[PDB]
Design a protein around this ligand. Structure first.
Ligand code: MET
Ligand code: CO
Ligand code: CO
Ligand code: K
Length: 304
């Protein structure tokens, strides 16, 4: 395998961490290949759940806990800390909140969160590599509580970063917030990518095509599929009670991705950097509720 950049995985990984049986587990947690039968039973449907009020309450709670856990991770970002160390803390913080770390054994993913450094677009696997000054690192947190998933990520700076990094990260965050601002009953899901690419392209960056935002509630990944690039063919119109993520991945160079031999880590083909932000959003009668927002501080961690 020919690496596309300077990043390498750092093995061995620690044995997978167990989750106490008193925490409720998603279906895939105990499937030998991590398959989610509940997801597969809806494969290829474009029909979108309209959430009940109980469902809404379950999403508010899990998404709020998910944010608390991301914040724990943000507090640990510094040169010298390994991504495994961050994952171990995430793992414990999930459990302290009586939640299952949704990534754990999802299609056999080995860890409890994704840590994506520099050229890693998404789904990097926490490992023995210490963060280095000048790195940018995304932590993606997904929690499962009382039958609901909640999902968010942010890109963080490690010590001081270059101007390229700041611009990349700032623009990615703007892309996300500009898409969120357009969310309300009656908007086509396909529109969000027109907004995202327009801003990304205006800043010289590209938009990853192989990974999309998604519905999330009782299932971790479900309808709608939500592309972040322009003139996509996404099916559906937003309605009050829809819940889904927006999670744009933007790249300094080209948009093309490939996957490491590990089956997960997605990297730019050109080895240039990529950044990402994500929220889970509830479409209301008039706009949208950002379920995974910070409740206590105005800005994302990188601006603080
Ligand atoms: C290894 S599963 C990680 C999934 C990620 N949290 C997402 O938003 O799709
Ligand atoms: Co996510
Ligand atoms: Co997501
Ligand atoms: K990255």
């Amino acid at each position: 395998y020919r690496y596309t950049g300077k990043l390498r995985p750092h093995y061995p990984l620690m044995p997978t961490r167990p989750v106490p049986s008193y925490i409720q587990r998603p279906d895939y947690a105990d499937h030998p290949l991590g398959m989610s039968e509940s997801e597969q039973a809806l494969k290829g449907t474009s029909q979108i759940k309209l959430l009940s009020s109980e469902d809404i309450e379950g999403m508010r709670l899990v998404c709020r806990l998910a944010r608390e856990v991301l914040d724990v991770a943000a507090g640990m970002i510094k040169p010298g800390v390994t991504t495994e160390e961050i994952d171990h803390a995430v793992h414990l913080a999930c459990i302290a909140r009586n939640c299952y770390p949704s990534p754990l054994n999802y299609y056999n993913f080995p860890k409890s969160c994704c840590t994506s450094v520099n050229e890693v677009i998404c789904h990097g696997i926490p490992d023995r590599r210490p963060l280095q000054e000048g790195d940018i690192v995304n932590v993606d947190i997904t929690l499962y509580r009382n039958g609901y998933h909640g999902d968010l990520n942010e890109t963080f700076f490690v010590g001081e970063v270059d101007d390229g990094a700041r611009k990349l990260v700032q623009t990615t965050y703007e892309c996300l917030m500009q898409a969120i601002d357009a969310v309300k009953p009656g908007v086509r899901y396909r529109e969000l990518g027109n907004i995202i690419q327009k801003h990304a392209q205006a800043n010289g960056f590209s938009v990853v095509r192989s990974y999309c935002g998604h519905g999330i509630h009782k299932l971790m990944h479900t309808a709608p599929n939500v592309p972040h690039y322009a003139k996509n063919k996404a099916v559906g119109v937003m309605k009050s009670g829809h819940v889904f993520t927006i999670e744009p991945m933007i790249c300094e160079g080209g948009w093309q991705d490939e996957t490491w031999p590990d089956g997960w880590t997605a990297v730019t083909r050109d080895g240039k950097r990529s950044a990402q932000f994500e929220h889970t959003l509830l479409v209301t009668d008039t706009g949208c509720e950002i379920l995974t927002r910070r409740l206590d501080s105005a800005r994302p961690h990188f601006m603080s």
